[PDB]
Amino acid sequence: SRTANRSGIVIRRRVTPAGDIIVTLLTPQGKLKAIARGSSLNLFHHVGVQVYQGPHNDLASVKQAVLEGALPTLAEPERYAFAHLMAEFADALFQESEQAFDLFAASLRGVAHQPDPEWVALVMSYKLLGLAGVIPQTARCARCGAPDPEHPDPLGGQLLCSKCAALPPYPPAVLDFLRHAVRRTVRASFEQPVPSADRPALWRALEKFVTVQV
């Protein structure tokens, strides 16, 4: 049959003034973008639904949408910006393995509940990138190849050596994380947070890294 029902999370939501709602889901079977005309189908819901596919309509229709679970807390300003981020990743990576789904899932869970939301977002950010096969390159300078570069790289979003570097070195906390960054477990990588004072460097870092890859 051409009619299938699946389990998902809404990582994107949109409307056209007709009252029709286009939506992007993340399912363990990959990402899937389905349309329905008319769970009320809300952003960040854990939902499940029947959707109809075919040549008749090349963007999948939607018949019955039913809510499994949900995370209200994500609206409060903090956890909010951070969610929208995580889902923007889920959308940019994971191109429609279930692993990514269980991860990003976990991300929303922890960005909702866990008391330090920005930390959740950093960690899960680099794990989401990583599982998706984008690894910050650390050991070798980006330009000359010198071991253990400690400086920001504006152009490539990688790390340059003091000799091949315009800006000062990322603080030791940010470096230690950056290096040992993708190896540690969520469990024990939450236990070793970058001091608040040094995160902004680490943010500005991640931003260009992503900008340049993704």
Binding residues for Zn(2+): 141, 144, 161, 164
The secondary element (H helix, E strand) that includes residue 179 is helix 172-179
Write the interaction track for other proteins spanning residues 17-56; mark x where CB under 8 A is met and - where it is not.
xxxx------------------xxxxxx------------
Q: Which residues make beta-bridge pairs with 31?
A: 26
- Residue 116 touches which of other proteins, Zn ion, none (CB < 5 to 8 A by kind)? none
**C-alpha distance across the termini of the chain, in Å:** 36
- Using an 8 Å Cβ cutoff, are 149 and 138 in contact? yes
Distance CA 106, CA 183 (A): 18
- Using an 8 Å Cβ cutoff, are 202 and 194 in contact? yes
Q: Is 14 in the site for other proteins (CB under 8 A)?
A: yes
The secondary element (H helix, E strand) that includes residue 65 is strand 61-69
Q: Is 144 in the site for Zn ion (CB under 5 A)?
A: yes
Cβ closer to other proteins: 26 or 141? 26
- Residue 91 touches which of other proteins, Zn ion, none (CB < 5 to 8 A by kind)? other proteins
Among 3, 64, 97, 99, binds other proteins (CB under 8 A): 64
Query: In sequence order, what are the residues at sequence separation of 6 or more whose Cβ sits closer than 8 angstroms to the Cβ of residue 117?
Result: 78, 79, 82, 111
- Residue 164 touches which of Zn ion, other proteins, none (CB < 5 to 8 A by kind)? Zn ion
In the complex, least distance from residue 110 CB atom to other proteins, rounded to whole angstroms:
18
Q: Which of residues 79-108 bind other proteins (CB under 8 A)?
A: 80-81, 84-85, 87-88, 91
**HSE value, Cβ hemisphere, 13 Å, CA-based, for 137:** 15
Residues of this chain that interact with other proteins (CB under 8 A) are 12-14, 16-20, 39-44, 64, 66-67, 70, 72, 74-77, 80-81, 84-85, 87-88, 91
